[PDB]
């Protein structure tokens, strides 16, 4: 929101000083401020149920002028338990005189998506027939590869044994979505003597990135699986002839590949 | 009664898989703690030199 | 048969404990990595 601040560089000592005096036009909120020492941090005066705090606190940072506008200030004031957000590039500022101004940005920058998305599929295993069926049902919250592209997801299913890729399947493409629905069924001939040695690897890829780095994320179930993945595999084996559906969180391709090697 | 020894076999195998997951937790714990001990080696050095540096 | 069910139940208990331990040691890893890279 609205906010008065000061900015000073002391050339004799080689140090930058920013004042965080007053904030105005807030949405009540019990606030506190924090200094962004561009690539330390400062704990400012924490008000309590104050829709317009004051701090008059100065913040000193001993950076040489050879840093020359490379760094950049950022301040994100939080309603204590990030409502206020404003940033200033270190190279937009003339230190011929100290500066004091009102900035009023009341919107922060949305954090990059860390989770890769989730995939739901069913597993069925018929021991007598030695037949394993995977139904890719749906995926959701897929992480976008690049901003400003459009994502065209599809799924690969690999049946592995002893680290060898035995059989490979793929879904159709669903253009322009992060929440594809498939309901596509794939069958594998796996004799019950072998059913316990195999892994089923499930990868979600972006077709628009085919031929470069295109994997969004993956999981595997079966031999050496862990977590919710083993739990789904064991449910399948516990329930012969019956399809069992479960959600899975997608994991980082390089992490899972290290597990599969 | 072949169904019975099939289901028993899949319980044995569930048990082996559960154990393999437990074994991986123990191996990962050991790997992490070892890496952190290299961290602590460094930290203890730095603190010896920052305490003699006063 | 009882042996199998008992042993599975034991393994399940230790897995539950170690899952908590692995969480705690990842916290430990975070704090120590912080103290170190200085």
């Amino acid at each position: 929101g609205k906010l008065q601040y000061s900015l000073d560089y002391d050339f004799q000592n080689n140090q930058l000083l920013v004042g965080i005096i007053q904030a105005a036009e807030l949405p009540t909120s019990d606030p506190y401020v924090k200094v962004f020492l561009l690539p330390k941090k400062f704990e400012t005066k924490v008000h309590r149920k104050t829709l317009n705090p004051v701090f008059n606190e100065q913040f000193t940072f001993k950076v040489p002028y050879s840093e020359l506008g490379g760094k950049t200030l950022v301040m994100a004031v939080y309603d204590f338990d990030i409502i206020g957000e404003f940033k200033v590039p270190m190279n937009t500022v003339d230190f011929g005189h100290v500066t004091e101004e009102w900035r009023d940005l009341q919107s922060a920058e949305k954090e990059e998506q860390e989770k890769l998305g989730d995939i739901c599929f069913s597993l069925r295993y018929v021991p007598t027939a030695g037949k394993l069926t995977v139904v890719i049902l749906e995926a959701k919250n897929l992480k976008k590869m690049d901003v400003g592209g459009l994502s065209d997801p599809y799924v690969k299913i690999h049946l592995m044994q002893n680290g060898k890729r035995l059989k490979k399947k793929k879904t159709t493409i669903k253009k322009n979505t992060l929440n594809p629905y498939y309901n596509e069924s794939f069958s594998f001939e796996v004799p019950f003597e072998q059913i316990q040695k195999v892994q089923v690897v499930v990868t979600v890829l972006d077709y628009d990135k085919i031929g470069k780095n295109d994997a969004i994320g993956k999981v595997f179930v079966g031999y050496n699986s862990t977590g919710a993945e083993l739990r789904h595999w064991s449910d399948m084996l516990a329930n012969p002839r019956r399809p069992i559906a479960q959600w899975h969180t997608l994991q980082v391709e390089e992490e899972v590949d290290a597990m599969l090697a | 009664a072949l169904s019975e020894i099939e289901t028993r076999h899949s319980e044995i195998i569930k048990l082996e898989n559960s154990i393999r997951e437990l074994h991986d937790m123990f191996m990962d714990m050991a790997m992490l703690v070892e890496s952190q001990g290299e961290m602590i080696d460094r930290i203890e050095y730095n603190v010896e030199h920052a305490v003699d540096y006063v | 048969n009882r042996r199998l069910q008992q042993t599975q139940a034991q393994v399940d208990e230790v897995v539950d404990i170690m899952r908590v331990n692995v969480d705690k040691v990842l916290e430990r890893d975070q704090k120590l990595s912080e103290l170190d890279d200085r």
């Binding site: 977590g227 969180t249 | - | 692995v22 990842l26």
Partner: peptide
């Protein structure tokens, strides 16, 4: 540098949590 290996390391960490189904606090 410290940022490349520290971000790489945090990826290793989330790897473990994901693998075992660990939720953060």
């Amino acid at each position: 540098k410290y940022a490349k290996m520290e971000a790489e390391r945090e990826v290793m960490r989330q790897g473990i949590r994901d693998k075992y189904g660990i939720k953060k606090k």
